[PDB]
Design a protein around this nucleic acid. Structure first.
Ligand SMILES: [Mg+2]
Ligand SMILES: [Mg+2]
Ligand SMILES: [Mg+2]
Ligand SMILES: [Mg+2]
Ligand SMILES: [Mg+2]
Ligand SMILES: [Mg+2]
Ligand SMILES: [Mg+2]
Lengths: 107, 79, 114, 127, 100, 99
RNA sequence: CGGUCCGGCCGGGAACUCAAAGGAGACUGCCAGUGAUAAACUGGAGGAAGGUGGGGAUGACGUCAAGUCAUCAUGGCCCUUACGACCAGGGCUACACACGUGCUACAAUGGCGCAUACAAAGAGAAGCGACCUCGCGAGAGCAAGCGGACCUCAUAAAGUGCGUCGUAGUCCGGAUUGGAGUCUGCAACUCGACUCCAUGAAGUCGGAAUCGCUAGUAAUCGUGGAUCAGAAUGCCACGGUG
């Protein structure tokens, strides 16, 4: 970093929606290299956000992303995941869905 | 712990039991077999169990059958 | 519902509620429900009194009560009153079956004090 | 007429057999939905057949040995791209743009002496 | 190691093929026979009068050149340091420092 | 009948020389041979200490590579057998014959 | 392609995967820009690989009288009916404490039950030991194949699908202890491994301080080997996900 000035890696996007930004979101929640169990929680959390908390699933995540703002998007997604773990609900898909609901209404 | 096909006992100590039954009880018998299984024909005798430097006599009791003679001799002195 | 195991099981599933009796784990609770004919996911609700007393008879084969406390205790009293080496381990609160006493003996020794 | 292309990964190896016309996928005498348990693994083999349009247009008969979930899926994705270069030979400009023809050669780093892992060092004391 | 310690190892092997090779092999089978002599085989008691030093559990695999009981290898029959001194002088065939 | 020769050695450049001497002799005398096949190399790997005391981390990394060659001969021609059975081969090559 | 008892199993096929002997291929080679027309850099094309591609082997003169008379080699000194040698048992595993190094945890990214898919790399003849049979199980009996790309260890685990528990000292976590046993070996008390029943400590994410790591890395999942009669949370390797 003192001499070695290089860029940052560009991972493959979301296979479901074609979103580059959502591919970085599932990697933060992913622990122990478990991609298969991480993306199932994120997909089920957004479907709760889409069907019962407002349409335009890709736009509904962006409104929740906008209030908590490369590094600006990185710190915003990290604050959602880490605050979702310390909640009172039952599952990780239910906790992160309520965090995106609160971030959409900036509270 | 040990398998059921034959409880282990040393040959020299088994000979010491047989003469003790016929000729009656004697002075406490010095031995080194800390690994022998106690049989019911030993009840009443006093066997001096070696514990590293000395021999401690153990009066055999009815409920000692099945245990080892090494389970009655501490090998270290603690203070 | 009061069993011969007088302590009242919680109002939950059958295989979990039988575990609260001293002497019945997870495996033995499965053996009682298999021998009686009651499913393991049936709660205390709808478990009729004709289905509770048939669990009293199946558990009656095993002594699981404060009577089981004294039988474990007097088995240790057989060791300590005999004067054996293993009986000396229980009287001072030291590990028996080969655990070291240099460090990491906190369960047997009790809390630390210099 | 068969069109063949070899793709592989860390410990996988996949063959690709192209026959003109269907939407059939037969992997290890199983179906696409039956063999691949992961939905992501189902779509990464569809990614090279995105710029080149397939609906009901070509057969693929594939087998694979070794590797895992994405190791087998990375082997097939490499194997399809060489089959399309075998098939048409003009498609290369779109395939070089996608980057799917490049063989990912990032193998596992060896377990080193003195360390419990490849880079993970046992815990260090200052003084 | 010491010369007396290697003399102990020769004494155990010379008794191992003597006593426990064929005699204790039979005594291990008859005690294991489920078909006959289920109660009074008494092969264990006859094993007690045999000498102890014939046991394969009591012998220690040691270096044939120096006698070190640590770092043994069954491929070489030597200790870990003496494998190096034969390797660097080419005395072990095909053995070389590797890279992978 | 069928006779086969398993050829195994440490050196890769030495095993194929003795392999080529057998197959070329067999083709010259009129035998039917389906070539030599390369069987997978069973390579052992040895990691031992270089120090007799502490500084545990410094070690040596050894290997022993054991190559394998198999030559299958279909017809037991007497001119084939009498030539190949007493050949002058390298000392570092072990032969295994199945008659 | 023929043949179906749906097994490459049997005729066969030599294509392909794999197996390993040799060789080609990457050399700033080409283009553009920057740079004193230099070395070099930046950008792009071609290419499987591009700017020492990825990894290993490979560690200069010296520094610390660093470590090794207990691998071995070796100057000198010392003992010698003893500082030697044999055997039994005990100790090296002790226990009021202290320190460093690890494993498993404190859980719903989980626990459990059922169903089920995908590895690589090694080991094996005083050995690996299938099938069959019995036991809840550790295993035991019977008994092939295999000095091995054939046979065996050997069903990889995470994952996937369904059901369940619903945030608690719990169906979390498994310590400790008792009872009943397996196997190894002259022999499992001191001091072995493992299974079964039962018991269910502390612990609900950890202060000052401190460590590893820039990519197939970290994290995590299992497997194998050396040592070994038996005795791996250590160490050496190997892949899976990432
Ligand atoms: Mg209970
Ligand atoms: Mg010497
Ligand atoms: Mg030993
Ligand atoms: Mg020095
Ligand atoms: Mg010094
Ligand atoms: Mg638990
Ligand atoms: Mg670096």
């Amino acid at each position: 970093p003192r001499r070695r000035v290089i860029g940052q890696r560009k991972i493959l996007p979301d296979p479901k929606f074609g979103s580059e930004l959502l591919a970085k979101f599932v990697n933060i929640l992913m622990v122990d290299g478990k991609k298969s169990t991480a993306e199932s929680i994120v997909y089920s959390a957004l479907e709760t956000l889409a069907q019962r908390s407002g349409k335009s699933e890709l736009e509904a995540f962006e409104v929740a992303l906008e209030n908590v703002r490369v590094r600006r998007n990185a710190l915003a997604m990290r604050w959602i995941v880490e605050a979702a773990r310390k909640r009172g609900d039952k599952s990780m898909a239910l906790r992160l869905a309520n965090e995106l609901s609160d971030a959409a209404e900036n509270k | 712990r040990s398998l059921k096909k034959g409880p282990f006992i040393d040959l020299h100590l088994l000979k010491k039991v047989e003469k003790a039954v016929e000729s009656g009880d004697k002075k406490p018998l010095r031995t080194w077999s800390r690994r022998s299984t106690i049989f019911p024909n030993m009840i009443g005798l006093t066997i001096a169990v070696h514990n590293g430097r000395q021999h401690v006599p153990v009066f055999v009791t009815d409920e000692m059958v099945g245990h080892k003679l090494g389970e009655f001799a501490p090998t270290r002195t603690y203070r | 519902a009061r069993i011969a195991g007088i302590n009242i099981p919680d109002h939950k599933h059958a295989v979990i509620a039988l575990t609260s009796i001293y002497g019945v784990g997870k495996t033995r609770s499965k053996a009682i429900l298999a021998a009686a004919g009651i499913a393991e996911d049936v709660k205390i609700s709808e478990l009729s009194e004709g289905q509770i007393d048939t669990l009293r008879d199946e558990v009656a084969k095993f002594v699981v009560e404060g009577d089981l406390r004294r039988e474990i205790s007097m088995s240790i009293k057989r060791l300590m009153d005999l004067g054996c080496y293993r009986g000396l381990r229980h009287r001072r609160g030291l590990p028996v079956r080969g655990q070291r006493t240099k460090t990491n003996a906190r369960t047997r020794k009790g809390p630390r004090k210099p | 007429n068969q069109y063949y292309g070899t793709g592989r990964r860390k410990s996988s190896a996949a063959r690709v057999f192209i026959k003109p016309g269907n939407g059939k996928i037969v992997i290890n005498q199983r179906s696409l939905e039956q063999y691949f348990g992961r939905e992501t693994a189902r779509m990464v083999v569809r990614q090279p057949l995105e710029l080149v349009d397939m609906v009901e247009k070509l057969d693929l008969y594939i087998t694979v040995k070794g590797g895992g979930i994405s190791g087998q899926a990375g082997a097939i994705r490499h194997g399809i791209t060489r089959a399309l270069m075998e098939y048409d030979e003009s498609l290369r400009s779109e395939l070089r743009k996608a980057g799917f023809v490049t063989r990912d050669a990032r193998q596992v780093e060896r377990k080193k002496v003195g360390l419990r892992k490849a880079r993970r060092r046992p815990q260090f004391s200052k003084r | 190691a010491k010369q007396s310690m290697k003399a102990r190892e020769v004494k155990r092997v010379a008794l191992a093929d003597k006593y426990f090779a064929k005699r204790a092999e039979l005594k291990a089978i008859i005690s294991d026979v489920n078909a006959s002599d289920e109660d009074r085989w008494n092969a264990v008691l006859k094993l007690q009068t045999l000498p102890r030093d014939s046991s394969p559990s009591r012998q220690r695999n040691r270096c044939r050149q120096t006698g070190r009981p640590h770092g043994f290898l069954r491929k070489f029959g030597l200790s870990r340091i003496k494998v190096r001194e034969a390797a660097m002088r080419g005395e072990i065939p095909g053995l070389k420092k590797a890279s992978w | 009948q069928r006779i086969r020769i398993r050829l195994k050695a440490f050196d890769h450049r030495l095993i194929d020389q003795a392999t080529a001497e057998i197959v070329e002799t067999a083709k010259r005398t009129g035998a039917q041979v389906r070539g030599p096949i390369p069987l997978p190399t069973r390579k052992e790997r040895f990691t031992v200490l270089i120090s007799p005391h502490v500084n545990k981390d410094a070690r040596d990394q050894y290997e022993i590579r054991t190559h394998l060659r198999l030559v299958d001969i279909v017809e037991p021609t007497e001119k084939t057998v009498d030539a190949l059975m007493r050949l002058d081969l390298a000392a570092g090559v072990d032969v295994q014959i199945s008659l």
